[PDB]
């Protein structure tokens with residue numbers, strides 16, 4: 001019921017989707033009555049290291065615009081010493097809400113979301129970025145299509161690769177492990193160590209090879225292979241994003 005200006009342009013605030021320290025996202029309308037998400041970050045108690053981290057993520061989001069529509073759109077931003085305003089594409093729902101509120105998934109819809117996850121992450125990898133904290137909440141469904149919102153620059157432990165737990169040690173392969181965990185959720189309705197009540201017992205489970213990960217028989221033997229390949233505990237043995245892109249699973253239907 002109130003307004004904002006970003007680079008000379010006024011936006012009407014429909015509602016706030018999300019709050020935080022010290023940042024917020026509002027769903028907003030421009031003068032053409034087009035819809036956007038505007039993130040606002042308050043820098044009042046933000047330190048130089050923090051500030052640079054933010055400037056860096058903003059820089060890369062802006063660059064990778066050109067290179068793939070599987071990264072969230074940034075149309076504009078206004079940045080001063082007190083705040084940031086980012087004028088971005090508005091999502092329909094984040095992947096995690098979407099999976100939390102889904103009772104199963106269309107095999108095709110899943111395959112199509114995988115293609116998207118791989119394309120976003122493939123991109124950032126091509127520019128030297130390793131997200132290294134990939135979750136469903138890092139993805140947005142926009143008009144049937146999955147988009148990556150964040151680059152890791154600016155549950156928790158479920159999607160964590162074992163090389164982060166033993167940690168000198170982080171490679172693009174760590175992202176593949178984490179994607180692996182997402183698909184697994186989308187295939188089996190849970191992450192690989194979600195059974196493990198206790199969070200230390202989990203951490204030993206994630207890194208211990210005497211712990212066979214289970215992969216129940218399912219109609220799509222390809223999906224089973226992809227999962228078996230991403231979730232190999234040794235990154236050197238694990239599969240690469242560009243290999244995953246040529247795999248029968250994403251290539252044949």
Ligand SMILES: COc1cc(N2CCC(O)CC2)ccc1Nc1cc(Nc2ccccc2S(=O)(=O)C(C)C)c2cc[nH]c2n1
Nearest residue numbers: 017018025027037088089090091092093094097137140149
């Ligand atoms: C109506 O627009 C939205 C609605 C929702 N939900 C609908 C309500 C609830 O049931 C589940 C989440 C979730 C996301 C959006 N759209 C968003 C959310 C965004 N981020 C966001 C918003 C609120 C809370 C958290 C985030 S997030 O960046 O941390 C991530 C979880 C999307 C962004 C960022 C850029 N564009 C965006 N579009």
